[PDB]
């Protein structure tokens, strides 16, 4: 008789790896030296269901990045590379977008960045509630702009931003790939108008579409008997 | 019969029994919004009565989208077309008249932000298969497959959930054994305070027979279900300079 | 400066941190909270809602709406059994995908009470009696109307009460839990020009004394 | 000494730090602050300044001073249109490079009001009437003087008011936003030995209720 | 009847091969805790490493060793060292088991790629 | 921020620690302590019990 762990915040405010970001430090294809992530809550199926218990949600965000590096094999594993610096730039809704590792949009002012050297504690940056409306929508029964044009159930209004990742240093002499892991912990959660859990599996991350599943697991009889 | 009270809104009148179990949506009454508001005080606050529907033994259910079902209903649809932003709360009377020799049951819910699932998975839904205004869209009992259509199946209700778990939303149970009518009052629910009334559907009325209509070999094979909807505390943006 | 000693546990990312953090976006104006109706501050508000139970989950009836309808009609015997299911909210396949079973699959420990509700969806002219027996845990399933009668039972008359509510006492999975059987007492007496076949539907929700202790992952979401 | 445990997030350079820092140059005398006139403590003092709008940005007129001059003269019809532009301060190409558009391109969210001002730069002998219609967002552009008349309009008489000010209500990009059209009502009546061709110039500034929420990089500076 | 404080001492040594000359970046380990009543992973790429109600710790090479406290998580009031009886349905099931006093289990994997 | 100097003895795991620790399971309800008879708060209660001595331990 406690009911302190059935709270909304003791149910949703837990960290979870949501995406893995792979990028290198020396290539020839000029887009494998960086990677990005458009921030949403629809990639981990667990957290997607736990947020689809409710229609409107409203939370802060605390992201912790776990950054690890492993060198690719070559002729020249015998090297002395100094410690690597990574950049994690945040693009708010309405910000410019880089198109290479040497693009000017890595240098712009109103895109907050974090510079981390190898060996330290993992980085961390908080992201506030940055919607125009009062709460995010998990569900949206309508069109975004000019109905019967545009995708059904979009809700332009609830975008949170996106991240970009590159190695700050120059091109090294051996290829070293770095994979980061993103721990997305929502904070100060308030939820409204609850709704039943999903029964069917998921098919895409941008719509509610499904194949019809059953209702439960079927029995053999209707009346029970002894062992 | 049982102390019938006669409600008159505007120039329309409807009859209701004395008991009148009214379900307020989430405990909240529809009120005004406490960059200027302009309200159509009562010229749009009257009962709008839809067509009766056809409940055989094999009827599986119906749904209406608000407020898309009142786009051809006089001054409410006029104020939908002239203004740009909108806000309203609703009152829904659902009568279903039948004799004492009939048996059946109905769930009457109102589902905010009911995003429908398409029949074919990665395709697009037309608007004529989501909403229709007048006479409703009917569920199916099996897995339907039509070109650019909602996945119509009762046991998932077009949303992917169990249909028995729809009692979390504001509901009543019309049991023809005892009850005769259901009455649900619904406030305004959105993340923004006013949204465009043609693009965004606020909620979805749903009527589903759990216990099917079932009767003798000589009675009437067919009972109607009369739906009556009446907006409460509606207002729009209005055009001035100041 | 000030002398400071580093304790062990430094420079690690424990996943259940509670420390402060710097903000990526200071000097930002957060839009204020608006009164939206229907606020949830506790998940055990959600599981206090009655919901229909698929008791008739005999095979090939699950993919339909017949999965909820419990058939009852006129029987030439009198001590037969209408339905029955094991009383395990979350382990049993009957109230598995029920909303209460869905709140209770996110926890490894749970305890409290449970309400059942049984509604008769026949005509207004029919009448009859049922025997809703409750076999406590440890006790077996009865095979007779008479063996179920000497236990804990309730006689529910159709002709004067269309819904009986049966608040089952203490049930737990880590604080065979019981059985709920339904026996005929009399046949269903019907006048002329009124159909014989009828339906019962179940409902279930928790009481206000329901607790949970340890969160986990749900056994129903499988990763692609 | 004192026992101290290192929390995660240590030894990193978060770019939006707020911590203290040691000074490279202590024992240095900073020259004191002198009263210099014109101090700015808020960027929304700057955008409360009216500025000329290049409404006549028809092609090849942009590289001149003719880009600001709106031509108006004597018309043998009477319900024609003088000018018109979409009401989007920052997205539209009309008030794109306006000072208010320049303060508003440094932010992803902005809301508030907007003032327009229309000044007639003809002779002191001319007279006439215009119809400054405001199509609200969602509503289309009217094609008639009469269709613009039943909307929100203002009749601005040249012969007794050389400047009309039109404070447009609520406009936002994340808190089709509207139109401002100008219709002839009467022709411009002119005496002898006074030239017929004349000019209107626009002005725009915000009101005191204007807010922004999230800074970003400007889309106009491109790196060499 | 006790709380639990677990400290993990993590050390790594490379196996010999042709390619000891390499530059591997620092390794991240995962230590996931499964409470009594939780799912169980069956590979390193299983989905149960990603589930929500299984608390994990992510540690990078070089820091102080990790530490996480584990409370008293039995249904009954105390653990039993001794139990004179059967767990379920006596003369079936193992003598002296006591289902009730399980505390959980741990799982370990390297977070990085191969 | 605040100036902080690391003393020696940092980032070690001394086995007889006494520091605080974060909890793996917050938001958890621990079942309350019941009165069980026979509580031991001292091992020198146990050795105040007479016990038979095997004096005749001839082989």
Map out the domains of chain D as residue ranges.
Answer: 1-224
Question: Residue B139 phi/psi, 5° resolution?
Answer: -65, 170
CA–CA dist C69, B141 (Å, integer): 15
Give the dihedral sign, CA B151/B156/B158/B161. negative
Closest of A167, A163, A223, A151 to residue A18, by C-alpha = A163
| CB C198, CB C121: distance < 8 Å | yes
CA–CA distances in Å: residue A124 to residues A90, B230, D34, E109: 12, 52, 41, 23
CA B197 to chain centre: 16
CA–CA dist F48, F46 (Å, integer): 5
| CB D181, CB D84: distance < 8 Å | yes
Mutation site, C25, C63, C81, interface A, largest A CB count within 10 A: C25
Question: Nearest C-alpha of chain C: how many angstroms from A173?
Answer: 30
Question: Nearest C-alpha of chain C: how many angstroms from B73?
Answer: 28
Closest of A47, A70, A66 to residue A57, by C-alpha = A47
Answer whether C31 touches A (CB < 8 Å).
yes
CA–CA dist C221, A45 (Å, integer): 7
Residues constituting chain D = 224
β-bridge partners, C7: D5
Chains that touch C (3 or more CB pairs under 8 A): A, B, D, E, F
- Taking every pair of Cα atoms in chain C, the longest distance, rounded to a whole number of angstroms, is 99
Helices and strands of chain D, counted as H and E runs: 2, 12
Q: DSSP assignment of C24-75, as one string?
A: SS-S--PPPPP--SSEES-GGGGGGS-EE-----BTTSSSSSTTS-EEE---
Chains that touch A (3 or more CB pairs under 8 A): B, C, D, E, F
Asked if E76 lies within 8 A of F31 by C-beta distance, the reply is yes
B62-65 and B203-208 as β-strands: parallel, antiparallel, unpaired?
Answer: antiparallel
- Residue from the list B83, B85, B240 with its beta carbon closest to the beta carbon of D152: B240
Answer whether E19 touches A (CB < 8 Å).
yes
CA–CA dist B138, B208 (Å, integer): 10
CA–CA dist F47, B117 (Å, integer): 74
Q: Which residue has the tokens 């406490």?
A: B34
Closest of C64, B140, C119 to residue A218, by C-alpha = C64
| CB A39, CB A160: distance < 8 Å | yes
Angle at A184 between CA A163 and CA C213, to 5 degrees: 175
Written as six digits, the tokens of C122 are 């026949």
CB atoms within 10 A of CB B24: 15
Written as six digits, the tokens of C191 are 């006048």
Q: Which residue has the tokens 């299983």?
A: E46
β-bridge partners, E106: E33
Written as six digits, the tokens of D84 are 């018109």
A17-23 and A176-194 as β-strands: parallel, antiparallel, unpaired?
Answer: antiparallel
CA–CA dist C170, A70 (Å, integer): 56
User: Which residues, other chains included, contact B78 with Cβ-Cβ below 8 Å and sequence gap of 6+?
Assistant: none
Strands (E), B73-193: 86-95, 105-112, 137-138, 172-175, 181-186
Helix (H/G/I), strand (E/B), else coil: D111? strand
Closest of C184, C182, C181, C150 to residue C77, by C-alpha = C184
| CB D208, CB D78: distance < 8 Å | no
CA–CA dist D172, D209 (Å, integer): 12
CA–CA distances in Å: residue A8 to residues A4, A131, C20, C101: 10, 21, 21, 18
User: Which residues, other chains included, contact E55 with Cβ-Cβ below 8 Å and sequence gap of 6+?
Assistant: A14, C15, C16, E32, E33, E68, F24, F25
- Residue from the list D7, D16, D214 with its beta carbon closest to the beta carbon of A92: D214
F5-7 and A136-137 as β-strands: parallel, antiparallel, unpaired?
Answer: unpaired
User: Which residues, other chains included, contact A63 with Cβ-Cβ below 8 Å and sequence gap of 6+?
Assistant: A124, A125, A126, A127, A182, A183, A184, A185
E28-34 and C3-7 as β-strands: parallel, antiparallel, unpaired?
Answer: unpaired
CA–CA dist B195, D138 (Å, integer): 11
Looking at residue D64, what DSSP letter applies?
A: S
Q: Burial, C41: exposed, middle or buried (Cβ in 10 Å; 0-12, 13-18, 19+)?
A: exposed
Per DSSP, helices labelled H in chain D are 99-104, 145-149
CA–CA dist B206, B157 (Å, integer): 9
CA–CA dist B124, A69 (Å, integer): 43
Residues constituting chain F = 59
| CB B146, CB B119: distance < 8 Å | yes
Asked if F10 lies within 8 A of C6 by C-beta distance, the reply is yes
- Residue from the list A152, A193, A210 with its beta carbon closest to the beta carbon of B125: A152
- Chain D positions touching A123 (Cβ under 8 A) are 9, 12, 14
| CB C187, CB C75: distance < 8 Å | yes
CB atoms within 10 A of CB B224: 13
Q: Burial, E11: exposed, middle or buried (Cβ in 10 Å; 0-12, 13-18, 19+)?
A: exposed
CA–CA dist B68, B133 (Å, integer): 6
CA–CA dist C17, A63 (Å, integer): 12
| CB E74, CB C174: distance < 8 Å | no
CA–CA dist B46, B69 (Å, integer): 15
F5-7 and C3-7 as β-strands: parallel, antiparallel, unpaired?
Answer: parallel
Q: Which residue has the tokens 């729009």?
A: B236
- Chain A positions touching C42 (Cβ under 8 A) are 3, 6-8
- Residue from the list A183, A193, A225 with its beta carbon closest to the beta carbon of C38: A193
CA–CA dist E84, E97 (Å, integer): 9
CA D163 to chain centre: 17
User: Which residues, other chains included, contact C79 with Cβ-Cβ below 8 Å and sequence gap of 6+?
Assistant: C144, C145, C146, C183, C184
User: Which residues, other chains included, contact D61 with Cβ-Cβ below 8 Å and sequence gap of 6+?
Assistant: D67
Helix (H/G/I), strand (E/B), else coil: A65? strand
Written as six digits, the tokens of D178 are 């509207």
Chains that touch B (3 or more CB pairs under 8 A): A, C, D
Buried/exposed code over F17-49 (b: 16+ C-beta within 10 A; e: otherwise): beeebbbbbebbbebeeeeeeeeeeeeeeeeee
- Chain A positions touching D223 (Cβ under 8 A) are 104, 107
CA–CA dist B135, A158 (Å, integer): 34
Chains that touch F (3 or more CB pairs under 8 A): A, C, D, E
Closest of D115, D99, D90, D103 to residue D172, by C-alpha = D90
Written as six digits, the tokens of C167 are 């608040």
Q: Rg (Cα) of chain D, in Å, rounded?
A: 25
- Residue from the list C8, C10, C217 with its beta carbon closest to the beta carbon of E38: C217
CA–CA distances in Å: residue F53 to residues C176, F43, F49, F56, F57: 49, 20, 12, 9, 10
Residues constituting chain A = 227
How many domains is chain B built from?
1
CA–CA dist A24, A167 (Å, integer): 8
Check chain A for breaks (C–N over 2.5 Å) and list the residue before each, or none: none
Looking at residue E13, what DSSP letter applies?
A: -
Residue of A nearest to F27 (CA): A5
Q: DSSP assignment of A103-142, as one string?
A: -GGGS-SSS-EEEEETTSPPPEEEE----SSSSEES---B
Helices and strands of chain E, counted as H and E runs: 0, 5
- Chain B positions touching A134 (Cβ under 8 A) are 191-192
Helix (H/G/I), strand (E/B), else coil: E54? coil
Q: DSSP assignment of E70-100, as one string?
A: E----SSSS--S---SBSSSTTSS-BS--GG
Judge D/C contact: 3 or more CB pairs < 8 A.
yes
CA–CA dist E51, C219 (Å, integer): 10
User: Which residues, other chains included, contact B194 with Cβ-Cβ below 8 Å and sequence gap of 6+?
Assistant: B33, B85, B86, B87, B237
- Structural domain boundaries, residue B211: 1-242
CA–CA dist C180, A149 (Å, integer): 54
User: Which residues, other chains included, contact B54 with Cβ-Cβ below 8 Å and sequence gap of 6+?
Assistant: B222, B224
CA–CA dist F20, C9 (Å, integer): 10
Give the dihedral sign, CA C202/C208/C211/C217. positive
CA–CA dist D123, D197 (Å, integer): 10
CA–CA dist A136, A130 (Å, integer): 10
Helix, strand and coil content of chain A, in percent to the nearest 5, comes to 5, 35, 60
Q: Which helix (H) or strand (E) holds B43?
A: none
Asked if F4 lies within 8 A of C4 by C-beta distance, the reply is yes
CA–CA dist A167, A178 (Å, integer): 9
Q: Burial, E35: exposed, middle or buried (Cβ in 10 Å; 0-12, 13-18, 19+)?
A: buried
CA–CA dist A98, A140 (Å, integer): 30
Domain annotation for chain A: domains and CATH numbers? 1-227 (2.60.120.20)
Q: Which helix (H) or strand (E) holds D159?
A: none
Residue of C nearest to F26 (CA): C16
Angle at B199 between CA B193 and CA B202, to 5 degrees: 55
Question: Nearest C-alpha of chain F: how many angstroms from D31?
Answer: 27
- Chain E positions touching C215 (Cβ under 8 A) are 35, 52-53
CA–CA distances in Å: residue A202 to residues A48, A49, C152, F13: 10, 10, 45, 46
Q: Burial, B118: exposed, middle or buried (Cβ in 10 Å; 0-12, 13-18, 19+)?
A: buried
Asked if E64 lies within 8 A of C7 by C-beta distance, the reply is yes
**Could you tell me the end-to-end alpha-carbon distance of chain B, in angstroms, rounded to an integer?**
55
Look up the CATH architecture of domain D1-224.
Sandwich (2.60)
B22-24 and B181-186 as β-strands: parallel, antiparallel, unpaired?
Answer: parallel
Mutation site, A2, A7, A11, A15, interface F, largest F CB count within 10 A: A2
Judge F/A contact: 3 or more CB pairs < 8 A.
yes
CB atoms within 10 A of CB C125: 17
Looking at residue D201, what DSSP letter applies?
A: E
C residues 16-45 lying closer than 8 A (beta carbon) to F: 16-18
Written as six digits, the tokens of C32 are 């204020």
User: Which residues, other chains included, contact D132 with Cβ-Cβ below 8 Å and sequence gap of 6+?
Assistant: D118, D153, D154, D156, D164, D166, D180, D181, D182
CA C138 to chain centre: 21
Question: Nearest C-alpha of chain C: how many angstroms from F16?
Answer: 11
Judge D/B contact: 3 or more CB pairs < 8 A.
yes
């Amino acid at each position: 008789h406690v009911r302190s762990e059935s709270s909304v915040e003791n149910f949703l405010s837990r960290s979870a790896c949501v995406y893995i970001v792979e990028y290198k430090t020396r290539d020839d294809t000029p887009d494998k030296m960086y990677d990005s992530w458009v921030i949403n809550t629809r990639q981990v199926a667990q957290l997607r269901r736990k947020l689809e218990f409710f229609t409107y949600v409203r939370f802060d965000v605390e992201v912790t990045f776990v950054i690890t590096s492993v060198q690719d094999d070559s002729t020249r594993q015998n090297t002395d590379t100094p410690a690597l610096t990574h950049q994690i730039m945040y693009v708010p809704p309405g910000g410019p977008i880089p198109q290479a590792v040497d693009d000017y949009n890595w240098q712009t002012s109103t895109n907050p960045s974090v510079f981390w050297t190898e060996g330290n504690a993992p980085p961390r940056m908080s992201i506030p509630f940055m919607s125009v409306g009062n709460a995010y929508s998990n569900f949206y029964d309508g069109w975004s702009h000019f109905s019967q044009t545009g995708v059904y159930g979009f809700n332009t209004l609830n975008n949170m931003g996106k991240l970009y990742f590159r190695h700050v240093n120059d091109k090294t002499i051996s290829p070293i790939t770095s994979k980061v892991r993103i721990y997305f912990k929502p904070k100060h959660v308030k939820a409204w108008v609850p709704r039943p859990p999903r029964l069917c599996e998921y098919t895409h991350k941008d719509n509610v579409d499904f194949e019809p599943k059953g209702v439960t697991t079927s029995r053999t009889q209707l009346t029970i008997s002894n062992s | 019969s049982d102390r019938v009270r006669s409600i008159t809104l505007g120039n329309s009148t409807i009859t209701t029994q004395e008991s009148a179990n009214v379900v307020v949506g989430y405990g909240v009454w529809p009120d005004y919004l406490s960059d200027q508001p302009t309200q159509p005080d009562v010229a749009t606050c009257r009962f709008y009565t839809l067509d009766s529907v056809s409940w055989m033994k094999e009827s599986q259910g119906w749904w209406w989208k608000f407020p898309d079902a009142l786009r051809d209903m006089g001054l409410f649809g006029q104020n939908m077309q002239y203004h740009y932003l909108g806000r309203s709360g609703y009152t829904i009377h659902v009568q279903c008249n039948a004799s004492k020799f009939h048996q059946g049951c109905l769930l009457v819910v109102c589902v905010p932000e009911a995003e429908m699932g398409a029949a074919n998975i990665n395709e697009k839904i037309n608007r004529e298969h989501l909403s229709n205004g007048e006479v409703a869209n009917t569920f199916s009992g099996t897995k339907s497959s039509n070109t650019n259509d909602v996945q119509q199946a009762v046991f998932n209700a077009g949303m992917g959930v169990a249909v028995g778990n729809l009692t979390i939303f504001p509901h009543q149970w019309i049991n023809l054994r005892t009850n005769n009518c259901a009455t649900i009052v619904m406030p305004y629910i959105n993340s923004v305070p006013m949204d465009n009334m043609f693009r965004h559907y606020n909620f979805t009325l749903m009527i589903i027979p759990f216990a099917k209509l079932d009767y003798a070999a000589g009675s009437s094979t067919y009972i109607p279900i009369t739906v009556t909807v009446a907006p409460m505390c509606a207002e729009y943006n209005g055009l001035r300079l100041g | 400066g000030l002398p400071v000693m580093n304790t062990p546990g430094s420079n690690q990312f424990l996943t259940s941190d509670d420390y402060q953090s710097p903000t990526a976006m200071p000097q930002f104006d957060v839009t204020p909270e608006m009164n939206i109706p229907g606020e949830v501050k506790n998940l055990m508000e959600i599981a206090e809602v009655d919901s229909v139970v698929p008791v008739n989950n005999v095979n090939e009836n699950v993919n339909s709406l017949e999965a909820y309808r419990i058939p009852v009609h006129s029987v030439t015997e009198t001590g037969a059994q209408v339905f029955g299911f094991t009383l395990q909210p979350g382990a049993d396949t009957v109230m598995e995908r029920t909303l209460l079973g869905e709140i209770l699959n996110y926890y490894a420990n749970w305890s409290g009470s449970i309400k059942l509700t049984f509604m008769y969806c026949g005509s207004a002219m029919a009448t009859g009696k049922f025997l809703l027996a409750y076999s406590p845990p440890g006790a077996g399933v009865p095979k007779n109307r008479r063996e179920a009668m000497l236990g804990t039972h309730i006689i529910w008359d159709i002709g004067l009460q269309s819904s009986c509510v049966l608040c089952v006492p203490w049930i737990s999975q880590t604080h065979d839990a019981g059985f709920i059987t339904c026996w005929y007492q009399t046949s269903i007496v019907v006048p002329a020009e009124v159909q014989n076949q009828s339906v019962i539907l179940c409902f279930v929700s928790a009481c206000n004394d329901f607790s949970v202790r340890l969160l986990r992952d749900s056994p129903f979401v499988r990763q692609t």
